[PDB]
XYZ file of C-alpha atoms in Angstrom:
271
model
C 56.248 12.723 100.903
C 53.297 15.083 101.533
C 53.038 17.741 98.838
C 54.434 20.386 101.222
C 57.658 18.401 101.487
C 57.670 16.871 98.016
C 60.555 18.240 95.946
C 58.517 18.184 92.729
C 55.530 20.202 93.945
C 55.342 23.783 92.636
C 52.842 26.667 93.038
C 50.559 26.774 90.014
C 51.533 30.453 89.651
C 55.014 29.428 88.522
C 53.484 28.131 85.295
C 52.187 29.783 82.177
C 50.510 27.527 79.626
C 51.118 28.990 76.188
C 50.202 26.573 73.400
C 47.889 23.596 73.668
C 49.490 20.668 71.877
C 46.706 18.210 72.430
C 43.393 17.526 74.031
C 41.683 14.261 74.826
C 39.256 12.404 76.987
C 41.419 12.702 80.107
C 42.800 16.227 79.801
C 45.184 18.305 77.719
C 48.864 18.712 76.957
C 50.363 22.173 76.673
C 53.665 23.838 75.930
C 54.349 26.330 78.682
C 56.961 28.114 80.721
C 58.060 27.666 84.309
C 59.080 30.911 85.992
C 58.922 32.690 82.678
C 62.082 31.258 81.097
C 62.069 27.455 81.150
C 60.060 25.699 78.456
C 58.150 22.687 79.731
C 55.322 20.358 78.764
C 52.238 20.476 81.008
C 49.715 17.634 81.105
C 46.467 18.514 82.853
C 43.872 16.125 84.220
C 40.301 16.679 83.139
C 38.421 16.525 86.448
C 36.142 13.501 86.578
C 37.579 11.777 83.481
C 39.678 9.370 85.511
C 41.049 8.863 89.007
C 43.364 11.620 90.268
C 45.255 8.847 92.061
C 45.675 6.975 88.796
C 46.787 10.155 87.065
C 49.432 11.026 89.648
C 50.738 7.469 89.946
C 52.551 8.101 86.663
C 54.408 11.034 88.187
C 55.326 9.004 91.268
C 56.824 6.309 89.074
C 58.827 8.876 87.090
C 60.477 10.059 90.301
C 62.068 6.592 90.429
C 63.215 6.523 86.817
C 65.511 9.441 86.234
C 67.904 9.044 83.323
C 69.038 11.140 80.333
C 67.237 8.770 77.950
C 63.889 9.053 79.731
C 61.591 12.082 79.709
C 62.223 13.770 83.050
C 59.521 14.731 85.542
C 59.871 18.481 86.040
C 57.160 19.196 88.600
C 53.619 18.542 89.785
C 50.644 20.566 90.961
C 48.510 18.211 93.072
C 45.604 20.641 93.487
C 42.843 20.335 90.904
C 43.156 20.665 88.047
C 46.096 18.360 88.626
C 49.184 19.030 86.517
C 52.121 16.802 85.613
C 54.948 18.929 84.204
C 57.703 17.292 82.166
C 60.810 17.792 80.094
C 59.862 19.530 76.850
C 60.837 17.696 73.675
C 60.911 20.058 70.735
C 60.315 17.607 67.896
C 57.391 15.759 69.441
C 56.642 12.078 68.962
C 59.025 9.915 66.930
C 56.190 8.469 64.864
C 55.228 12.049 63.902
C 58.757 13.380 63.505
C 59.743 10.633 61.063
C 57.070 11.930 58.677
C 58.241 15.554 58.612
C 60.570 16.878 55.870
C 63.437 16.619 58.364
C 62.520 13.122 59.513
C 62.169 11.906 55.945
C 65.706 13.012 55.010
C 67.302 11.016 57.836
C 69.940 8.459 56.817
C 69.683 4.825 57.899
C 72.726 5.689 59.994
C 70.825 8.277 62.064
C 67.821 5.968 62.305
C 70.062 3.247 63.749
C 71.486 5.832 66.120
C 68.000 6.748 67.324
C 67.107 3.066 67.717
C 70.182 2.549 69.912
C 69.235 5.577 72.036
C 65.814 4.045 72.661
C 67.382 0.692 73.557
C 69.694 2.546 75.930
C 66.739 4.101 77.719
C 64.996 0.743 77.862
C 68.176 -0.854 79.262
C 67.938 1.537 82.199
C 64.305 0.630 82.761
C 65.351 -3.020 82.550
C 68.149 -2.626 85.089
C 65.835 -0.842 87.524
C 63.313 -3.730 87.470
C 60.590 -1.792 85.691
C 58.615 -2.568 82.561
C 56.948 -0.012 80.281
C 54.237 -1.982 78.475
C 53.442 0.757 75.936
C 56.693 0.860 73.969
C 56.048 2.117 70.461
C 57.184 5.051 68.300
C 54.273 7.210 69.469
C 55.743 7.046 72.980
C 59.261 8.051 72.083
C 59.863 11.819 72.044
C 62.473 13.639 69.976
C 64.493 16.635 71.163
C 65.678 19.662 69.259
C 69.093 17.964 68.766
C 67.427 14.804 67.463
C 68.071 12.706 70.519
C 65.335 10.323 71.666
C 63.766 9.710 75.070
C 61.291 7.171 76.426
C 57.958 8.736 77.379
C 54.441 8.008 78.627
C 54.884 5.883 81.731
C 51.160 5.477 82.401
C 51.327 1.679 82.046
C 54.814 1.313 83.467
C 55.179 -0.896 86.540
C 57.709 -1.916 89.155
C 58.303 -5.666 88.920
C 58.684 -7.294 92.349
C 58.982 -10.762 90.899
C 59.699 -11.352 87.200
C 56.117 -10.716 86.036
C 53.149 -8.345 86.118
C 49.679 -9.715 85.270
C 47.043 -7.322 83.899
C 43.329 -7.556 84.597
C 41.488 -10.046 82.402
C 39.387 -7.163 81.121
C 42.557 -5.326 80.073
C 43.153 -4.950 76.342
C 46.345 -3.875 74.590
C 47.421 -2.897 71.016
C 47.675 -6.265 69.301
C 50.325 -5.306 66.759
C 52.789 -3.997 69.358
C 52.096 -6.365 72.241
C 53.921 -9.623 72.890
C 51.886 -12.855 72.481
C 52.157 -13.924 76.122
C 50.834 -10.537 77.189
C 47.984 -10.705 74.668
C 47.122 -14.291 75.574
C 47.769 -14.447 79.320
C 48.000 -10.810 80.377
C 51.533 -11.586 81.562
C 54.095 -8.830 81.009
C 57.851 -8.885 81.619
C 60.759 -6.810 80.275
C 60.871 -9.477 77.545
C 57.401 -8.327 76.455
C 58.866 -4.845 76.008
C 61.670 -6.384 73.948
C 59.040 -7.795 71.560
C 57.455 -4.339 71.343
C 60.860 -2.836 70.656
C 61.196 -5.146 67.651
C 57.900 -3.734 66.342
C 59.092 -0.195 67.113
C 62.151 -0.879 64.947
C 59.816 -1.463 61.977
C 58.190 1.921 62.651
C 61.612 3.527 62.542
C 62.765 2.020 59.262
C 59.418 2.695 57.559
C 59.199 6.298 58.812
C 56.132 5.662 60.933
C 54.152 3.084 58.908
C 51.681 0.893 60.831
C 53.134 -2.579 61.578
C 51.956 -5.625 59.636
C 50.928 -3.766 56.476
C 47.566 -4.812 55.048
C 46.700 -7.135 57.933
C 43.914 -7.086 60.496
C 44.603 -8.073 64.093
C 43.028 -11.571 63.589
C 45.381 -12.045 60.646
C 48.378 -10.934 62.741
C 47.413 -13.369 65.500
C 46.873 -16.173 63.016
C 50.230 -15.594 61.340
C 52.184 -15.395 64.569
C 50.751 -18.693 65.727
C 51.901 -20.364 62.487
C 55.453 -19.266 63.270
C 55.401 -16.360 60.811
C 56.650 -12.919 61.786
C 56.252 -9.516 60.145
C 57.219 -9.450 56.487
C 60.504 -7.662 55.764
C 59.718 -3.906 55.609
C 60.636 -2.139 52.390
C 64.288 -1.112 52.330
C 64.976 -2.705 55.701
C 68.670 -3.694 56.185
C 68.738 -7.461 56.689
C 70.962 -7.026 59.750
C 68.261 -4.906 61.345
C 65.563 -7.351 60.235
C 67.386 -10.247 61.924
C 67.708 -8.156 65.113
C 63.909 -7.650 65.017
C 63.527 -11.425 64.683
C 65.506 -11.970 67.901
C 63.042 -9.643 69.601
C 60.192 -11.770 68.305
C 61.393 -15.165 69.524
C 58.637 -17.439 70.743
C 59.871 -17.969 74.288
C 60.305 -14.648 76.170
C 63.463 -15.910 77.854
C 65.122 -16.448 74.469
C 64.653 -12.786 73.545
C 67.722 -10.539 74.003
C 68.285 -8.030 76.787
C 67.970 -4.321 76.022
C 71.632 -3.862 76.921
C 72.448 -6.396 74.210
C 70.177 -4.623 71.723
C 71.765 -1.280 72.562
C 75.261 -2.608 72.005
C 74.370 -4.229 68.688
C 72.593 -1.126 67.395
C 75.553 1.085 68.338
C 77.776 -1.269 66.354
C 75.371 -1.065 63.402
C 75.506 2.710 63.665
C 79.266 3.006 63.959
C 79.494 0.692 60.980
C 77.080 2.548 58.679
């Protein structure tokens, strides 16, 4: 819809940006208020840093993926500077939260709970024929009640047929990205499942970088020998074997996110 009919468009005057949470090459992220009382996150586009069409495409995709386990699009201001307003998540990124005094005290039980919540959000994305492609603890946000939601849909895509192929010049985080996506640029929901297995190691290690002590060439070399990430310290073997399913060689042999959600809930209700 044109912005004058779009249900997400709001007058910029309805927003007050109060605290800048971050600033980067393509703009800033602020904590603000909509119509004085509702706390929201506001991401602003730095004019000229990237395409305004590319920036807003993320908001258009979020209109199609509304679910409790996914950060909700709150509003948009299409006039420059362009703003994407979203659901505020009080405890920030999971990879950061796990390192705070509160995150550190979490039991393995609550960590398994959070992992299941993430799988539940990814199961929705899976059922709607989308892929995320940037699934990692930095892109999970944590609310004030310690619930988790999927965030940062900049690389997310609608899959018409089973697979999305990136540009050959495209490069992705080697430690989190599935082999077929690194090698062929081919992404499917099964590539996200591999990434989820890596995200599970970030959860159990309270935010440690995957593949401790290894460079990306060493990670690639080990994976091609059939090795997978070494058991993280204090990782429950049941959770480690679930990570291994996520890292199966053939994408089609990897589990569905609905399966992963169900298993993790069982792990949680057991612990």
